[PDB]
Structures are given as structure tokens and as C-alpha cells.
Amino acid sequence: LPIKLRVEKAYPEDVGKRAVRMDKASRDRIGVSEGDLVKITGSKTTVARVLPAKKEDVGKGIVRMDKYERQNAGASVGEPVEVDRA
Ligand SMILES: [Zn+2]
Ligand SMILES: [Zn+2]
Ligand SMILES: [Zn+2]
Ligand SMILES: [Zn+2]
Ligand SMILES: [Zn+2]
Ligand SMILES: [Zn+2]
Ligand SMILES: [Zn+2]
Known part of the structure; x- marks a missing residue:
């Protein structure tokens, strides 16, 4: 089973990386x-590398994604996505 996390925006320093941040x-x-590689599925599915969370975000059930990953996962900011090992 995947886990669900809420999409939030990437920090500018991570925009244009095929990567997402999670705690x-x-x-x-x-x-x-x-x-490592994760699979991320909103209404569509994509893959990205795992980065750690920034300190401000530890313990939040979010996953930070830039616009390209959000487009490829078919998910908007504030919506949940399913995340699993790739
Ligand atoms: Zn920074
Ligand atoms: Zn990206
Ligand atoms: Zn590993
Ligand atoms: Zn690092
Ligand atoms: Zn949506
Ligand atoms: Zn939010
Ligand atoms: Zn759901």
C-alpha cells in the first residue's frame, strides 16, 4: 500500500529537479x-527522487513538488497524492 501526503509547492532551490521532499x-x-526513486500518483503517475524535508516541514504530512512533478502526477497544491517505492 502507498502512503498519502498533501502536495505543497517546492522551494525555489528545488524547482527543475526531478525530486520531491518528504520527512x-x-x-x-x-x-x-x-x-531513492518514488512513484507519485494523483490522477496521473510519475516518478521522482526522494529528498529530505527542510526543518520547517519535519512532521508535516506533506510532499513538496515543483510544477513539472505536479503536472505529471495530475495533482494540485493542497491535494493528496499516493506515494510508493518505484
Ligand atoms: Zn534554501
Ligand atoms: Zn521537478
Ligand atoms: Zn534505499
Ligand atoms: Zn540532500
Ligand atoms: Zn485535482
Ligand atoms: Zn497548503
Ligand atoms: Zn485520496
């Missing part, structure tokens, strides 16, 4: 470490 609890729940 360690979230990584632990799907069994991935920083640098």
Missing part, C-alpha cells in the same frame, strides 16, 4: 532513503 517518518513508512 523521515514519511520515508520510513514506504521504506525509502534519500536519493
Whole structure:
């Protein structure tokens, strides 16, 4: 089973990276470490590398995604997506 996390915007420093940020609890729940590939599915599905959360975001059930990943997952900011190992 995947986990669900709420889409939020990427920090500018991560825009144009095929990568998303999620905290360690979230990584632990799907069994991935920083640098591994995750599958992300809103209404569409895409893949991206796992980055750790910024400190301000630890413990939040969010996943930070830039515009390209949001487009490819078919998900808007504030909507949940399913995240699983790739
Ligand atoms: Zn920064
Ligand atoms: Zn990207
Ligand atoms: Zn790993
Ligand atoms: Zn890093
Ligand atoms: Zn939507
Ligand atoms: Zn929000
Ligand atoms: Zn749902």
C-alpha cells in the first residue's frame, strides 16, 4: 500500500529537479532513503527522487513538488497524492 501526503509547492532551490521532499517518518513508512526513486500518483503517475524535508516541514504530512512533478502526477497544491517505492 502507498502512503498519502498533501502536495505543497517546492522551494525555489528545488524547482527543475526531478525530486520531491518528504520527512523521515514519511520515508520510513514506504521504506525509502534519500536519493531513492518514488512513484507519485494523483490522477496521473510519475516518478521522482526522494529528498529530505527542510526543518520547517519535519512532521508535516506533506510532499513538496515543483510544477513539472505536479503536472505529471495530475495533482494540485493542497491535494493528496499516493506515494510508493518505484
Ligand atoms: Zn534554501
Ligand atoms: Zn521537478
Ligand atoms: Zn534505499
Ligand atoms: Zn540532500
Ligand atoms: Zn485535482
Ligand atoms: Zn497548503
Ligand atoms: Zn485520496
